[PDB]
Design a protein around this ligand. Structure first.
Ligand SMILES: NC(=O)c1ccc[n+]([C@@H]2O[C@H](COP(=O)([O-])OP(=O)(O)OC[C@H]3O[C@@H](n4cnc5c(N)ncnc54)[C@H](O)[C@@H]3O)[C@@H](O)[C@H]2O)c1
Ligand SMILES: NC(=O)c1ccc[n+]([C@@H]2O[C@H](COP(=O)([O-])OP(=O)(O)OC[C@H]3O[C@@H](n4cnc5c(N)ncnc54)[C@H](O)[C@@H]3O)[C@@H](O)[C@H]2O)c1
Ligand SMILES: Nc1nc(N)c(NC(=O)Nc2ccc(C(=O)N[C@@H](CCc3nnn[nH]3)C(=O)O)cc2Cl)c(=O)[nH]1
Ligand SMILES: Nc1nc(N)c(NC(=O)Nc2ccc(C(=O)N[C@@H](CCc3nnn[nH]3)C(=O)O)cc2Cl)c(=O)[nH]1
Lengths: 290, 289
C-alpha cells in the first residue's frame, strides 16, 4: 500500500527553514521582509489561499498586507496600485492573486509587477529565465511539486514522468523543471517528461502513464488518474483541487493508493507546499540576490 | 515506402514568398531590409551555415553583411559591436552565430541584441513570450520544423510526438510549439509531446517513439532513430547534422522503409532554418511586434 506523502509535514520543515533564514537576516541588521498581496473580488478559494499565505508569512517572520479591491476595479486602477507598490521600498515581494475578472488582462497585470518583487515568477522575464534554466524566481506551485519529489527521495534522472495539464502557471513549469539538466544554473530533474492536456485522448494518456515512474496531475478533473493507468510502485502527485459531492484532487485516491508506491493527498498535499515555497521566494526577494 | 520531404524545395518556395514580400515593401517606399550576422572564430560548420544565410538573403532581396571576429575577442568587445549595430538604423536584423567561445556568455550576448532586431528569437523577452504562447519572434530552426509539418499537412492535434533533444535553441522550442494550444495568440500544435534527452535510457526512448505519430530528433547522434523504434507510417523529422559524409540522427535508409514521412540530411531541416530566418528578417524590418 502507498506511502501517503504529507505536504503539511514537508511544508512545516520548509517554513521552519525560512523562519531561521529570515531571523538570521534580521539579526544581521537588515530590514524585515514584507510581502504585499493584492486580492481582487470575492472568489472564496482565492481568499482562503491568500489567508493561508499571510498566516504563513507571519509565522516565519515576514511582514505582510493583503490589499483587497472590488471585482469592479478597472485595469488602470489595478495598474496604479501595482506601480505605487513597486515604488514602495518597504515592499520586497508583490503578487496579484489569480484569477482576475474577465475585463482585466492577467498577462498585462503580471508583467506590471517589478521583476525583482515578482515572487510568483509570472513576469515574462522570469518565465523566460526559467525556461532557459537560469537563476529565477520559481513559481510556487511547480516548485512545491519539485520539493515534494526531491524531499521524499523519489529519483527523477532518467525516469519517465507524465504531466497532465499544460497551463502556463502550473503544468508547463512543472514539465520544465522535471525534464531539464541537473547541471544548469537552475538544476532540473533530468526526467523523460510527457506533456498531456485537454486534447490528449484518454487511451493515449493511459498508454503513457503506465510507463511512468511519476505521474503529476494538474488538470482539475476528478478521477482522471485511476489505478489501471499507474505503474505499480509509481509516485503520483496530485495538484488538482476539485469540488465534488467535498474536496478531491485529480486522482482516485483510494484506488490509486493500492497500486502506487507514493501518493499525495488532497487537501494537505501540494497546497501547503505552494504556500511554503512562496515564503522561500519572499526571503529570496528581500535579499535581492537575483 | 516513406515520402521523402525535400526541405530544400520547401525552403526555396518560402524564399520566393519572402522575395515578393520584400519587393513590395521596397516598392511601397520603405528601405530595403538589411541583416547583420556576427561570426566569431573558425567553426567550419558555423562558417558554412552563415554563408547559406547570406546567400539566401541575396536571393530574397535583403542586404546583408557577415562580420567575422577572432575567437579571442572579449565579451565586452562583442557587446560593443552589438551596441553599435543596435544603434545603426540601417540594420534591421542582427544575429550572433552560435556557439561562441567559452569566455563569452551566450545568454548575455543574446540578451544584448535589441529585441526589435532579434531575428533569432533568442532574447529572453522573445523566449518568455514564446513560452507563454504570445506573439513573438520564433527561432528559425524550430519554426522550420513546424513549417515542414504544417506545409506537408501532417496532423498534430491529439497526436503523440517525441522530441529527442532539449536544447534551449532547438529541442525546447520545438516541444513548446508542438504541445501548446492552437487557440492561443501564437497557436501551438496541441500534440502530446514527450521530451527525451541525454539521460533518457535507449530502452525508454524506444518505448515512447514506438507510440509516436511524429518523431523529431535534435540530439546529434548518428543512428539514434532506427526502424524498430518507429511505428508504421509515422513522420520522422531529422534535425541532427553529424559528420561521420553528413548524416542525421536517423538511420535514413532503414526508417525510410517504415515511416510514412521522412526528412533527409542534408537538404532537410537545414534549408528550412535558413528560409525561416529570412521570414523573421522581413518581420523585423516591418516592426511587426
Ligand atoms: N497548490 C495546489 O495544490 C494548486 C496550485 C495551483 C493550481 N492547483 C490546481 O490545479 C488545477 C489546474 O489549475 P490551472 O490553473 O493549471 O488550470 P487550467 O484550467 O488553466 O489548466 C488545466 C490544464 O488541464 C489540461 N487538461 C484538460 N483536460 C485534460 C485531460 N483530459 N487530460 C489532461 N490534461 C487535461 C488543460 O489542457 C489545461 O492545461 C486546479 O485544480 C487548480 O486549483 C492546485
Ligand atoms: N537546421 C538544422 O538542421 C539544425 C539547426 C540547429 C541544430 N541542428 C543540429 O541538431 C543537433 C543538436 O543541436 P542542439 O543545438 O540541440 O545541440 P546540443 O548539443 O546543445 O543538444 C543536444 C541535445 O541532445 C540531447 N541528447 C543527447 N543524447 C541523447 C540521447 N541519447 N537521446 C536523446 N537526447 C539526447 C541532449 O540532452 C541535448 O538536449 C546537431 O546535430 C546540430 O547541428 C540542426
Ligand atoms: N498570483 C497567484 N495566483 C494564484 N491563484 C496562485 N495559486 C495559488 O495560490 N494556489 C493555491 C495556494 C494554496 C492552496 C492551499 O492552501 N491548499 C490547501 C487548502 C485547500 C482547501 N481549500 N479549502 N479548504 N481546503 C490544500 O490543498 O491542502 C491551494 C492553491 Cl490551489 C499563485 O500561486 N499565485
Ligand atoms: N545565432 C544562431 N546560431 C545558430 N547556430 C543557429 N543555428 C543554425 O544556424 N543552424 C543551421 C543553419 C543552416 C544549416 C544548413 O544550411 N544546413 C544545410 C547544409 C549542410 C552543410 N553544412 N556544411 N556542409 N553541408 C543542410 O542541412 O542541408 C544548418 C544548421 Cl544546423 C541559428 O539559427 N542562429
Amino acid at each position: 500500500e502507498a506511502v501517503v506523502i504529507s505536504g503539511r509535514k514537508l511544508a512545516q520543515q520548509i517554513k521552519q527553514e525560512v523562519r531561521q533564514e529570515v531571523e538570521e537576516w534580521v539579526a544581521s541588521g537588515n530590514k524585515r521582509p514584507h510581502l504585499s498581496v493584492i486580492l481582487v473580488g470575492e472568489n472564496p478559494a482565492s481568499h482562503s489561499y491568500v489567508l493561508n499565505k499571510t498566516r504563513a508569512a507571519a509565522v516565519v517572520g515576514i511582514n505582510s498586507e493583503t490589499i483587497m479591491k472590488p471585482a469592479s476595479i478597472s485595469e488602470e486602477e489595478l495598474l496604479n496600485l501595482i506601480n505605487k507598490l513597486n515604488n514602495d521600498d518597504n515592499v520586497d515581494g508583490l503578487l496579484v492573486q489569480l484569477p482576475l475578472p474577465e475585463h482585466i488582462d492577467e498577462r498585462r497585470i503580471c508583467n506590471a509587477v517589478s521583476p525583482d518583487k515578482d515572487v510568483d515568477g509570472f513576469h515574462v522575464i522570469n518565465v523566460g529565465r526559467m525556461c532557459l534554466d537560469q537563476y529565477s524566481m520559481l513559481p510556487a506551485t511547480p516548485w512545491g511539486v519539485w520539493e515534494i519529489i526531491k524531499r521524499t527521495g523519489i529519483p527523477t534522472l532518467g525516469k519517465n514522468v507524465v504531466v497532465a495539464g499544460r497551463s502556463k502557471n502550473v503544468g508547463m513549469p512543472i514539465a520544465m523543471l522535471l525534464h531539464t539538466d541537473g547541471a544548469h544554473e537552475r538544476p532540473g530533474g533530468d526526467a523523460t517528461v510527457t506533456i498531456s492536456h485537454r486534447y490528449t485522448p484518454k487511451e493515449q494518456l493511459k498508454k503513457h502513464t503506465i510507463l511512468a515512474d511519476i505521474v503529476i496531475s494538474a488538470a482539475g478533473i476528478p478521477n482522471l488518474i485511476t489505478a489501471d493507468m499507474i505503474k505499480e510502485g509509481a509516485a503520483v502527485i496530485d495538484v488538482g483541487i476539485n469540488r465534488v459531492h467535498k474536496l478531491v484532487g485529480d486522482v482516485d485516491f483510494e484506488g490509486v493508493r493500492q497500486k502506487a508506491g507514493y501518493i499525495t493527498p488532497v487537501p494537505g498535499g501540494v497546497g501547503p507546499m505552494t504556500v511554503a515555497m512562496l515564503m522561500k521566494n519572499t526571503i529570496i526577494a528581500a535579499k535581492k540576490v537575483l
